[PDB]
Ligand SMILES: Nc1ncnc2c1ncn2[C@H]1C[C@H](O)[C@@H](COP(=O)(O)OP(=O)(O)OP(=O)(O)O)O1
């Protein structure tokens with residue numbers, strides 16, 4: 418080389434060059450790197466968690482894990498990422514093992530329940546089997562499994578080692594057909610190790626979702642402020658964070674997102690009372706501005722785009738900005 422010399426950057430690039438080469442893309446990155454923008458992606462439904470994932474949504478053909486304490490926001494997230502998939506006329510499966518979906522809450526989010534394949538597995542060696550067997554076909558686009566913690570091994574539900582081995586296997590047999598089909602998988606996880614102590618490594622994306630404040634300002638408490646930290650992202654630098662709202666019954670607050678998200682970058686101003694926009698006003702009081710966007714889809718689609726144009730993302734317009742070495746630029 419030239420050791421007892423300097424750290425000059427030329428050589429190090431060959432390393433990575435090869436590491437990404439032997440272990441595949443994503444094996445080594447610089448946290449604040451330039452992200453590789455793809456074409457196919459499933460928007461999560463919250464602009465915030467989107468750019469947080471850095472690519473616009475969730476990656477395809479990759480397994481994603483969503484763990485977190487009860488009633489935090491996982492399923493929704495799932496349920497939304499599920500609806501959007503369908504917006505591109507896709508087939509989405511759902512493996513029930515918790516027996517807790519309310520097809521009508523799904524209904525208000527976007528889900529075309531009547532098209533949604535919902536299996537209710539007899540045991541653990543079935544939700545994984547029907548999963549893969551439903552996966553190897555390749556007609557789907559996104560398959561969801563409710564709780565990695567309730568997939569008890571055939572043996573157990575009758576008459577040690579099992580669950581982790583169960584996951585370890587099928588998830589090895591499956592991580593292989595999902596990539597060769599672009600079928601993205603979501604594995605909800607109810608944290609409160611052995612089961613997902615494979616999924617952990619098998620996964621590409623791993624979202625951590627926790628409830629924060631109980632959205633307060635009127636009728637009683639209408640929503641909940643969810644934070645989400647992407648502790649593992651083998652498709653873009655990791656450790657990013659996005660916070661967002663999910664109104665009871667309403668779902669993840671898109672509009673609400675666009676505001677905090679739209680000011681946190683300079684497209685939307687002042688706002689003592691008043692949240693103005695490029696000259697005109699969107700209203701006084703967040704909820705109100707929240708109202709004006711959900712009453713003016715047009716203005717709403719102008720702030721989601723504009724923003725997705727200042728930070729990459731695979732899309733619609735921007736058309737010139739993107740390339741030639743290193744930089745997020747401020748916080
Ligand atoms: N079926 C429903 N009908 C009406 N509101 C709902 C329904 N289901 C969930 N919610 C609301 C209340 C909560 O604030 C929020 C939680 O999102 P959710 O996706 O259910 O979280 P989660 O699935 O990660 O947690 P849990 O562990 O409780 O299953 O959505």
Ligand SMILES: Nc1ncnc2c1ncn2[C@H]1C[C@H](O)[C@@H](COP(=O)(O)OP(=O)(O)OP(=O)(O)O)O1
Nearest residue numbers: 465468469656657658659660678681682745747748
């Ligand atoms: N709570 C939030 N904090 C920061 N960014 C957020 C948040 N919620 C959503 N976003 C979106 C909005 C921002 O325009 C974008 C992230 O800002 P960004 O400056 O690009 O941070 P980053 O690249 O410097 O930080 P990190 O060091 O954590 O890797 O993501």
Ligand SMILES: [Mg+2]
Nearest residue numbers: 655656657658
């Ligand atoms: Mg961060």
